[PDB]
């Protein structure tokens, strides 16, 4: 018998940690936990972003249709009068959609004038890259909306989470003018294509199609692939580099394991060339015009 | 070196220890059921009537004179023992212990049930999920006897009554891995019983509790399992040769 | 000689999981026709040696109650006949056990 | 001592939700304090892991150590309380997921050498446990074939990157 | 120790700071008693220096919780979800601060190893190097002893 | 180097080997089946095969008596030997003992052992494993082919 | 009709599914059945069984997986039965295995399973721009060398006969077949619906028709593997992976007044009845020559 | 698939035993005969 307190509490907490470890509880809701308090959290996340929103505009995005309708089940099951103050909640699908359709717009917009050579199908592409569930999801967790998302199950599914997002971008056009809403977008959803190639969220399929297609267009005959240099064919590792010439003219030239996939990555280099999304482009201009 | 094992189970019982007893074992309840009422083999199809039944009902508990002394004796031993009163009560209480079993409240379902009726319902049941509703009653609960037991040498008056219920239930037992096991739980299918209470009469407390379960011999017979049962033979010794019956 | 050094875990288990040391599972095990108990190819049944032998032990018991000596065999063949049964023309002049059993199926009259 | 191996059996699961997959059934047993040695008892449950209940039977049955009786008649019981007391139909759909053998109590005793000299003898106890899982038995694992080989190290050489270089 | 513990590249949070920079620091809850002597640290900075951080930091939600509690403690929340829990058991009013104003600078990330102290994307600009990009071309591409 | 060698190695040496087949031999006689070790059962086989044949010799053999006087230790097996073993092993050339191998003991020794039974002796027949009938797959195509070759003759 | 072979077998897919449900709907409840074991070895076993759902491979299940491994026969009270067929009323059954002293129900069922599979791989293995009709598969004893499996072929594949690389290439068709393992089952249905389901093949709705004409309630037994359907006599075996040996042994064309049949002769032992290398050789080389037995 | 061991006297019956020697047997006399004049083929 050790006569002492400190020991045994601290095993305690031992205990509690291994028990943590074994067993671990499910995702709690931030409200749920108890240092909370919604009005002060509606007062940060307005000014940590540097925006004026309006606190009953935040408070409309910040509803959900499904959070309703359990507060209404809670309701029926309780037995008590709410519909004096639940039904007046103004959900937030209308913020939404417009959100949407400006996040949308402007997002097209402004790859337009940053791509003039991108195709309607190509800027569409990156415009649903943009707007994706999850792109908009990781924005939102990382900007603590989830968490500030008055929604039944916690988790606050993508479809959820994309929702709440877009109402409060049209909280936030509703509030304050068009060119701060687009300021916002620029900054919260283009930043995270830095780094990312046009294709890797494009997914086209005939790249050699779409490069002749391109070439037709701009009045250009016929690429050739020519085998420019390899190394090694009876290896079982074959390098093999395919350049394409238009009027002898080399345009671009892919590396590959075999001479398919080079003249595909070819293709693929040229189409880049060609569309302007280029490793060797602009950066985005981060500005106050 | 020299040490041993210990921690030996047995169990192994003595008269001489039982009957040397300071104190006697006080019991709750009798052993079963003395007199069982045996039903005639025609309540099936006089149970589609309904003025026909609740005539033979009300004509059969009055006509008997072993049950109208049983009610007397239990009047003059507690007073405010009313039988039309009864039916409801025992109603409510079967309600209840069915519901207290669905979620395993074992200390309500000792108050309610008595001790030669928990096991019967707890044994086979403890680990395993109930999912019982109660929907409909087709017909209400009808006291069909009163028994009463009186033992001399305690001084102990047990009184038990006998009430046919026609019930309309919904069962679903799962098991412990959460499949169905026994039956579908949207299902409402009817069963008839014969409830006996038992209530001791010398206890001032006394509280009503359900004591047995009596089915008919002629009650269809139960719902079939949801798994193949295979009944294995008997096991032969080899200087043994097998006998096939006919 | 004495070891140098403790062996490890590693080594102790290297050494005495080989599959040289392992149980090998045996591919010859089939079931008997007979009684459908499991026996191996080259190996006769257990359970009907067992009743075999049980019979085997009966015949003679009763065979060794016939004779009052240990030293008195007999000078002639010997034939079992059980319940129901009796000596025919080639079985007679022979010395006869006689069983109370039924004759078991497997036992042929020959 | 410390006994869980035997109430790990005793776990409820919720009723499974209509349309979710059949969990197979588990059903734990153990045999406690036998003389048989430790790892003498460890070959026999290592032979017959992941192996088919019946078949694990057949070379118990067969197997010459003095605890392939033990064991066997472990597999018995185990296959006897599933079929019993668990839900479980197809007596002969069990495989064995986990076949374990642990130490227990051991008792010391004195073994004389000569000279007077003496060692501490210990009488040696096993525990064996067993978990029979409702269901086919797994597949054995194959091993790893050229193509796989060669796509392993195709994706190896491809992984890499021009370390302190940026 | 590096084979001991984790690592993790210098990585920034949603990009932070390329478009705006948003403060990480998202909650701030200070945990201390009215009557423990060890709590005069917290007592005296919540009295003097929270309202001026409160100020001065405005997209960070401050508590203050007095409580029956031995070792005052301040748990920061940051937008990564992550959670600091530090102590200001038997500190200085300065010290508090300088704790403070570390954790509303501090990014919320892991501290661990950092393998790289550079984070660039695409750093392959105007190519990067391959075997090929220093040879030079042979008329037609022949192999040094193949005959045409 | 055991090259060459056809007696095994039992007991404490030759003498005490012959022993013991002599007294595994009274038994078989005495008892017309017997079981025990698989190595004792087969070196046994061929002194038994002997026996039949030295009883063949005729009563009188006055080589063949005093054999059997030497092996068989209970003398009242000696006129069964000559009088019911011999006279019924008359067509049978060397078909006298037959040889089965029976599941280990059940002791802790957990030895291999064998059966040995005089043939045509009064005692339940022994499983003998027995070949598949003619009716199975494998048998009726050998069957079909033993009468494709009859009929080509 | 303009049908791919892909949509014919889609479609037969589809409809022998539906028949199936409705089979499986006709029995709304789940009835119980008393089944005796009537085997030599556990006598007096009794099982619990699901009226139309359980199958004697279910009660090999509950004896021992023995049973499953060796029994390929199942005898219900009166005559064979398949693994894979549901028992209807209660009854007694007897397992029958390939070793067992009268086989020759269990190798009557082997060797229509075989020619089944035979027929199955030589349907396919054609040209589509070709058409390719089985007719039946003609019951020839066990002592004769080989299972027999009739086709006709397009008019303008009369000429050539397959030479050793084609039977080859059957052979490893037939061995690909075998080892994914596809079980058999076994469907009890009309003529009404087995002409819809056929419908193309004018041999297999002559067969269809001369079945149901000695069968007073005109009841067709149909048997399905995979995504091949056919019609035959009498149960099959339980799983393909019982046969391990097969081959293609050869071809013969007969020509009758109306059309000329193809009739391919193969041979096959199963896993339990594997041969050696010189006596497999031998039976295929018996089985080489020609096998006629249709009445 | 735990196939056993399966040697070719296995399923064999008693009657085809010595017929698969003898179609052994003469066969490979046959080999052999043929063979015995190698300068003429
Ligand atoms: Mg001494
Ligand atoms: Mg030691
Ligand atoms: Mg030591
Ligand atoms: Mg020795
Ligand atoms: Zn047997």
Redesign the pocket.
């Given at each position: 018998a050790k006569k002492g307190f400190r020991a045994a509490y601290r095993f305690q907490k031992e205990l509690e940690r291994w028990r943590l470890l074994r067993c671990p509880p499910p995702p709690v809701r931030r409200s749920e936990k108890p240092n909370w308090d919604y009005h002060a959290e509606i007062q940060a996340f307005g000014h940590r972003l540097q925006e004026t929103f309006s606190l009953d505009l935040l408070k409309t995005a910040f509803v959900n249709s499904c959070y309703i309708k359990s507060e209404e089940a809670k309701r029926q099951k309780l037995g008590i009068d709410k519909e004096a103050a639940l039904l007046n909640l103004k959900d937030n699908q209308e913020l939404s959609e417009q959100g949407i359709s400006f996040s949308q717009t402007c997002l097209t917009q402004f790859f337009e004038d940053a791509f003039p050579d991108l195709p309607t199908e190509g800027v569409t592409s990156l415009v649903d890259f943009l707007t994706s569930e999850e792109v908009v999801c990781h924005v939102a967790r990382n900007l603590a909306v989830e968490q500030l998302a008055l929604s039944a199950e916690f988790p606050v599914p993508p479809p959820v989470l994309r929702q709440t997002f877009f109402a409060v971008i049209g909280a936030l056009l509703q509030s304050s003018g068009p060119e701060r809403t687009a300021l916002f977008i620029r900054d919260f959803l283009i930043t995270q294509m830095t780094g990312k190639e046009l294709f890797e969220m494009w997914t086209i399929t005939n790249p050699m199609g779409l490069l002749v297609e391109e070439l037709k267009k701009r009045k250009i005959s016929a690429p050739e692939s020519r085998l420019t240099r390899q190394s090694g064919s009876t290896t079982a590792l074959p390098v093999y580099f395919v350049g394409l010439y238009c009027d002898r003219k080399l345009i671009a030239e892919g590396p590959g394991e075999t001479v398919l996939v080079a003249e595909e990555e070819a293709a693929r280099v040229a189409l880049r060339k060609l569309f302007g999304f280029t490793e060797n482009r602009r950066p985005w201009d981060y500005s106050k015009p | 070196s020299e040490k041993e094992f210990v921690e030996h189970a047995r169990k192994a019982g003595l008269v001489i220890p039982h009957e040397r007893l300071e104190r006697p074992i006080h019991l709750a309840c009798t052993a079963g059921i003395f007199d069982a009422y045996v039903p005639p083999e025609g309540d099936a199809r006089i149970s589609s009537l309904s003025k026909e039944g609740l005539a033979q009902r009300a004509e059969r508990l009055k006509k008997n004179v072993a049950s109208q002394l049983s009610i007397r004796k239990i009047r003059e031993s507690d007073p405010n023992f009313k039988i039309k009163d009864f039916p409801e009560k025992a109603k409510d209480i079967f309600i209840e212990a069915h519901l207290c079993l669905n979620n395993s409240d074992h200390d309500r379902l000792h108050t309610l049930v008595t001790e030669n009726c928990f096991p019967d319902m707890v044994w086979d049941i403890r680990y395993k999920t109930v999912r019982w509703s109660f929907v409909e009653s087709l017909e209400p609960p009808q006291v069909v006897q009163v028994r009463c037991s009186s033992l001399m040498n305690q001084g102990n008056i047990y009184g038990q009554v006998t009430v046919r219920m026609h019930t309309r239930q919904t069962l679903a037992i799962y098991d412990r891995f959460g499949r169905l096991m026994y039956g579908q739980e949207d299902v409402p299918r009817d069963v008839l019983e014969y409830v006996v209470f038992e209530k001791h009469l010398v206890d001032p407390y006394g509280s009503w509790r359900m004591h047995g379960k009596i089915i008919p011999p002629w009650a269809p017979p139960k719902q079939p399992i949801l798994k193949t049962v295979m009944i294995p033979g008997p096991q032969l010794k080899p200087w043994e040769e097998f006998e096939e019956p006919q | 000689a004495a070891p140098k050094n403790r062996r490890s875990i590693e080594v102790n288990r290297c050494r005495r999981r080989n599959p040289q040391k392992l149980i090998k599972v045996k591919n010859n095990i089939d079931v008997c026709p007979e009684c459908g108990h499991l026996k191996q190819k080259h190996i006769l049944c257990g359970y009907c040696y067992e009743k075999v032998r049980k019979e085997t032990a009966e015949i003679r018991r009763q065979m060794g109650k016939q004779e009052g000596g240990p030293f008195r065999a007999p000078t002639t063949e010997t034939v079992v006949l059980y319940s129901g049964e009796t000596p025919s023309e080639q079985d007679q002049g022979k010395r006869i056990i006689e069983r109370e059993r039924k004759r078991p199926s497997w036992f042929t009259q020959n | 001592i410390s006994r869980k191996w035997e109430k790990k059996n005793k776990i409820v699961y919720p009723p499974q939700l209509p349309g979710e997959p059949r969990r197979p059934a588990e059903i734990y047993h153990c045999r406690r304090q036998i003389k048989y040695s430790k790892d003498k008892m460890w070959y026999l449950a290592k032979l017959i892991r992941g192996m088919s209940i019946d078949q694990a039977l057949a070379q118990l049955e067969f197997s010459d150590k003095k605890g392939a009786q033990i064991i066997k008649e472990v597999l018995l019981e185990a296959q006897d309380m599933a079929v019993r007391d668990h839900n479980v139909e197809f007596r002969s759909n069990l495989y064995v997921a986990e076949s374990t053998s642990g130490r227990g109590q051991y008792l010391k005793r004195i073994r004389y050498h000569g000279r007077g000299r003496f060692?501490?003898?210990?009488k040696v106890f096993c525990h064996y446990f067993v978990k029979l899982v409702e269901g086919p038995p797994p597949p054995r694992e194959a091993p790893k074939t050229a193509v796989a080989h060669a796509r392993e190290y195709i994706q190896e050489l491809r992984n890499r990157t021009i370390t302190h270089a940026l | 120790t590096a084979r001991g513990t984790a690592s993790r590249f210098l990585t920034s949070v949603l990009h932070n700071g390329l478009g705006r920079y948003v403060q990480q620091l998202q909650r701030l809850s200070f945990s201390l008693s009215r009557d423990a002597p060890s709590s005069r640290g917290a007592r005296e900075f919540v009295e003097r220096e929270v309202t001026d951080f409160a100020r001065r930091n405005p997209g960070v939600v401050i508590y203050v919780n007095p409580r029956p509690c031995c070792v005052p403690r301040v748990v920061a929340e940051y937008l990564n979800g992550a959670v600091r829990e530090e102590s200001i058991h038997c500190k200085s009013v300065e010290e508090i601060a300088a704790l403070v104003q570390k954790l509303a600078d501090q990014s919320g990330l892991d501290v661990i190893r950092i393998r790289k102290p550079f984070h660039t994307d695409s750093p392959s600009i105007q190519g990067q190097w391959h075997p090929f990009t220093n040879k030079p071309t042979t008329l037609g591409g022949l192999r040094p002893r193949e005959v045409q | 180097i055991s090259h060459g060698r056809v007696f095994r190695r039992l007991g404490l040496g030759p003498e005490s080997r012959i022993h013991l087949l002599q007294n595994l031999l009274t038994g078989l006689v005495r008892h017309e089946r017997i079981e025990a070790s698989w190595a004792r059962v087969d070196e046994l086989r061929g002194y038994a095969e002997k026996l039949i044949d030295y009883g063949k010799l005729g009563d009188t053999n006055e080589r063949a008596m005093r054999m059997a006087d030497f092996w068989l230790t209970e003398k009242d097996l000696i006129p069964k030997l000559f009088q019911v073993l011999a006279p019924r092993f008359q067509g049978q050339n060397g078909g006298y003992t037959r040889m089965l191998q029976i599941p280990n003991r059940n002791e802790q020794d957990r030895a291999k052992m064998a059966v040995i039974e005089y043939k045509g002796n009064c005692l339940p027949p022994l499983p003998l494993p027995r070949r598949d009938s003619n009716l199975t797959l494998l048998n009726q195509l050998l069957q079909g082919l033993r009468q494709d070759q009859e009929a080509s003759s | 009709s303009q049908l791919s072979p892909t949509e014919l077998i889609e479609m037969q897919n589809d409809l022998f599914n539906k028949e199936k449900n409705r089979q499986l709907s006709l029995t709304p409840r789940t009835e119980k059945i008393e089944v005796k074991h009537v085997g030599k070895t556990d006598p007096g076993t009794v099982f619990v069984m699901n009226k139309n759902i359980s199958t004697p491979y279910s009660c090999a299940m509950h004896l021992s997986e023995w049973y499953c491994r060796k029994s390929i026969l199942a005898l219900v009270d009166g005559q064979p039965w398949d693994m894979y067929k549901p028992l209807t009323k209660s009854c007694e059954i007897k397992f029958l295995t390939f070793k067992d002293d009268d086989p020759g129900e269990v190798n009557k069922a082997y060797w229509r399973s075989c020619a089944m599979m035979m027929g199955c791989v030589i349907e396919r293995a054609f040209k589509d721009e070709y058409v390719v009709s089985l007719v039946r598969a003609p019951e020839v004893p066990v002592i004769a060398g080989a299972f027999c499996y009739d086709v006709v072929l397009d008019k303008r594949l009369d000429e050539w006969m397959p030479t050793k690389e084609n039977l080859h290439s059957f052979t490893k068709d037939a061995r690909a077949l075998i080892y994914k393992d596809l079980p058999f089952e076994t469907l009890e249905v009309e003529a009404k619906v087995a002409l819809e389901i056929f419908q193309h093949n004018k041999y297999k709705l002559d067969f269809i028709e001369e079945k149901a004409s000695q069968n007073p309630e005109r009841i067709v037994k149909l048997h399905r593997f995979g995504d091949f359907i056919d019609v035959s006599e009498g149960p099959l075996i339980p799983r393909t992976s019982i046969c391990f040996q097969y081959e293609v042994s050869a071809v013969h064309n007969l020509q009758t007044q109306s059309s000329l049949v193809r009739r391919f002769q193969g041979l096959s032992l199963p896993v339990h009845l594997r041969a050696h290398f010189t006596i497999w050789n031998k039976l295929l080389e018996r089985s080489r020559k020609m096998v006629t037995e249709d009445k | 698939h735990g196939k056993s061991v399966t040697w070719w006297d296995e399923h064999l019956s008693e009657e085809n035993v010595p017929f698969v020697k003898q179609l052994v047997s003469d066969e490979n006399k046959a080999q052999l005969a043929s063979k015995l004049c190698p300068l003429k083929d």
């Open positions: - | - | - | 060692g501490i003898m210990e | - | - | - | -």
